[PDB]
Design a protein around this ligand. Structure first.
Ligand code: PU6
Length: 208
């Protein structure tokens, strides 16, 4: 069964801003997602130092970038801590409420969209390039879930029956028709080198 939820009004407002504002420097979505992956990998690494069994779901700590021109998706995969149902439905939105307010305040005063990551809401920059985002995630203490949203004020959560992932998160970007450059090897390499060159985990860019 699929459950449908409304975003909090402030998140919905953030998403509409991201979708609606004219802003050409869209490529920053990728460093925001890689940065989120890096934080998640830091988290499981740290937690495993006092409970080694937390890596029974997989010892390798890495990031994969997987373009698929047939499906028109760019997927950012990590083996980080993953997210629980409670994260997906309630807790991330709760935390994002204050970040959104600060960000939207910063934007008048002359900040720009590239600075979104300073406010803890960089995930939503995915909507600069994606018409739909699907997030598949597995946390040690919980089941594998699929979260999905095409914005418009709602998202869904379902238990995921797909290929079990062990532990971590896949963000599947269903790209807008005019954003297929982010499926091109040379373009992704350029962006990673420019914005994500010092991430402390291997980033493997898959080819097609
Ligand atoms: C705000 C950072 C924590 C939430 N989070 C995020 C950011 C985020 C925020 C909101 C989200 C979301 C993801 O999926 C659905 O809603 N990415 C990851 C990740 N790769 N691994 C673990 N946790 C993540």
């Amino acid at each position: 069964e699929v459950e449908t939820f409304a975003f909090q009004a402030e998140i919905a407002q953030l998403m509409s801003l991201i979708i609606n504002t004219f802003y050409s420097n869209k490529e920053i979505f990728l460093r925001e997602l890689i940065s989120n992956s890096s934080d998640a990998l830091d988290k499981i690494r740290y937690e495993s130092l006092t409970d080694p069994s937390k890596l029974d779901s997989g010892k390798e700590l890495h990031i994969n970038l997987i373009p698929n021109k047939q499906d028109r998706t760019l997927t950012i995969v990590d083996t980080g801590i993953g997210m629980t149902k409670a994260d997906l439905i309630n807790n991330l939105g709760t935390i994002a409420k204050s970040g959104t307010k600060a960000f939207m305040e910063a934007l008048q005063a002359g900040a720009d969209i590239s600075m979104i990551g300073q406010f803890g809401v960089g995930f939503y920059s995915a909507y600069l390039v994606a018409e739909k985002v699907t997030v598949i995630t597995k946390h040690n203490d919980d089941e594998q879930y699929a979260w999905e949203s095409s914005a418009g004020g709602s998202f869904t959560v379902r238990t995921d029956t797909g290929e079990p992932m062990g532990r971590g998160t896949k963000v599947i970007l269903h790209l807008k028709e005019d954003q297929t450059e982010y499926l091109e090897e040379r373009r992704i390499k350029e962006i990673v080198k420019k914005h994500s060159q010092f991430i402390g985990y291997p980033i493997t860019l898959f080819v097609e």
